[PDB]
Amino acid sequence: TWLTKIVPDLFRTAGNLHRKLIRLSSDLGEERIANPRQQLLFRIEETRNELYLLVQSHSPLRVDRLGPGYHQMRNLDPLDKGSRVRYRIVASPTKRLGRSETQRLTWLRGAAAEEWWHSRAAANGLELLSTYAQDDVRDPGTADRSRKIRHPAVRFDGEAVISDVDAVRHAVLNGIGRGKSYGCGLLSLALI
DNA sequence: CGCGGACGAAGCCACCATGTGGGCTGTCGCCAGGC
Numbered sequence A: 001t002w003l004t005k006i007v008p009d010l011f012r013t014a015g016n017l018h019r020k021l022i023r024l025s026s027d028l029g030e031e032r033i034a035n036p037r038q039q040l041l042f043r044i045e046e047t048r049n050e051l052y053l054l055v056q057s058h059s060p061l062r063v064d065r066l067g068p069g070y071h072q073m074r075n076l077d078p079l080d081k082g083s084r085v086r087y088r089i090v091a092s093p094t095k096r097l098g099r100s101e102t103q104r105l106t107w108l109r110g111a112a113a114e115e116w117w118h119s120r121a122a123a124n125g126l127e128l129l130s131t132y133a134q135d136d137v138r139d140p141g142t143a144d145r146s147r148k149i150r151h152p153a154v155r156f157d158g159e160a161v162i163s164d165v166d167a168v169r170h171a172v173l174n175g176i177g178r179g180k181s182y183g184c185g186l187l188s189l190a191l192i
Numbered sequence B: 001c002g003c004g005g006a007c008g009a010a011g012c013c014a015c016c017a018t019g020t021g022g023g024c025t026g027t028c029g030c031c032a033g034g035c
Helices: A014-022 A112-121 A165-174
Strands: A002-006 A041-046 A052-057 A073-075 A089-091 A154-156
Touching: A041 A089, A112 A165
Parallel strands: none
Antiparallel strands: A002 A052, A002 A073, A041 A052, A089 A154
């Protein structure tokens, strides 16, 4: 993978955030499996002005119109088990259930979000997830370009001893939780 | 030598007072639900 610090300017909506992330990468690929996760990822870091954002990626980004005045960028290749390292992350805990008139949506509170998350990591890296328990988007009018929704993210943080390296790294590259294209998924680690 | 231009010749009369005015303008919170 490879990491960059980038910052869009004029961002009014989340979908245009997605599009500004894909229009700077020409050769794009998508390798999918029926039920498993798709194989960029990204995290919103400062949103009231322009919008600074950390991107994880496979294909190299170069500045575009109204981009940075420079191409930071580093290419990284990943992490010994038993050792603790800093984590991080935004995701959307949900419960899907039959809806009157299907619906994404202990169990809310800060304890089934912790249950949900450590479910997400599973045998990979053991961690503690900052529990949130509370973003809107609409289509920019372009045909076949989504529509309008709501949503709710949660950020999580600390050091996460990993129990399987290739598989937590697998999780780092695949992403944790739905809506990866709308801010979620990216797990960030650092040595303790 | 002739014509044209310029200049000249007058008749002239002389203790103490100040006040006016009035005419041009635009703004949100967003989304969802119910009537």
